[PDB]
Amino acid sequence: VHEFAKELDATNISIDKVVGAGEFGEVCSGRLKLPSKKEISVAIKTLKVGYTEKQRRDFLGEASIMGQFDHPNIIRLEGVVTKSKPVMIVTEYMENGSLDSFLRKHDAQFTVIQLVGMLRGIASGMKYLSDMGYVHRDLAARNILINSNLVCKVSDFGLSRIPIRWTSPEAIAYRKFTSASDVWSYGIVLWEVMSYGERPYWEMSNQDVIKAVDEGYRLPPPMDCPAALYQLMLDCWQKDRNNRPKFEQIVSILDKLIRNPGSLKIITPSNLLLD
Ligand SMILES: CCOCCCNC(=O)c1c(N)n(-c2ccccc2Cl)c2nc3ccccc3nc12
């Protein structure tokens, strides 16, 4: 883990509050004093007392992966604490939490351009991940964090190298995970954002989510969704993975939509639509 994660001195970390329950232990917020003496807000994941050696490996394994990525739209690893206990992973602080829970608090309260900004950040982060040869496999709005300035960053590197609702049909069918299956997931995230955090496929049985999508059914346009953005979803959800856009193309599409907000003016039987 120390190839990609710096070892932090525990004396430089202040823990202020527990803010969540993680897979391996509590998540806290606090402050980190940098070698320059600058103090920054951080999130702190702790490894629970009485951990097994395997838990320690899987815990720190995330830091090993996260530490390979230095990008504005990927959660920044500040470092780890391993030489003292509790074992910790320290990352940049994201004031507004998970993107899906954030948007649910704000239904219909953002502009389309604000939402497109969020989406462009996520796409940029994914473009870099895929450039680096990583397939995330768990790209979902719940695994995107959002800061005080609404900047969105990819998080949760525990499953990367299954979440049925976010997974492409071929990855469900025979574990064909590629950057193009991450693009499928991105289309689902795009739907989540434009739906202000609605659950994809609501509470449909997983068996029906699998069967419906395989038959060609797709999530319907979110309320007041621009046609450009719904078409982007449909493109991300092409049955043939070779026909899905690459993340670089997605970033380019969104940059155009940011540039000419007017374009967004054009707005878009069964719950799901047959394409
Ligand atoms: C409602 C607003 O809450 C914002 C709290 C601050 N959150 C962060 O900055 C987090 C943050 N940077 N991480 C995180 C993500 C990936 C790797 C390491 C960490 Cl510490 C979190 N992992 C979490 C796991 C479970 C629950 C809450 C969590 N919050 C955060």
Side-chain angles (χ1 to χ4, degrees), residues 19-21 27 43-45 62 66 89 91-97 105 145 155:
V19 303
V27 185
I44 305 153
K45 280 167 74 128
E62 170 173 45
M66 178 180 342
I89 296 169
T91 63
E92 71 182 302
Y93 180 70
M94 302 290 284
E95 181 174 295
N96 284 311
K105 292 184 205 177
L145 292 170
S155 188

Side-chain angles (χ1 to χ4, degrees), residues 118-155:
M118 296 174 193
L119 291 160
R120 194 271 187 206
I122 301 162
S124 187
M126 290 305 305
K127 195 277 184 178
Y128 188 56
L129 287 184
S130 51
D131 270 9
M132 294 286 287
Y134 190 70
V135 183
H136 191 284
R137 301 191 175 193
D138 201 14
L139 176 58
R142 70 180 179 276
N143 293 328
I144 300 301
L145 292 170
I146 183 167
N147 79 6
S148 59
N149 296 322
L150 306 186
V151 179
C152 291
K153 307 191 187 206
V154 183
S155 188

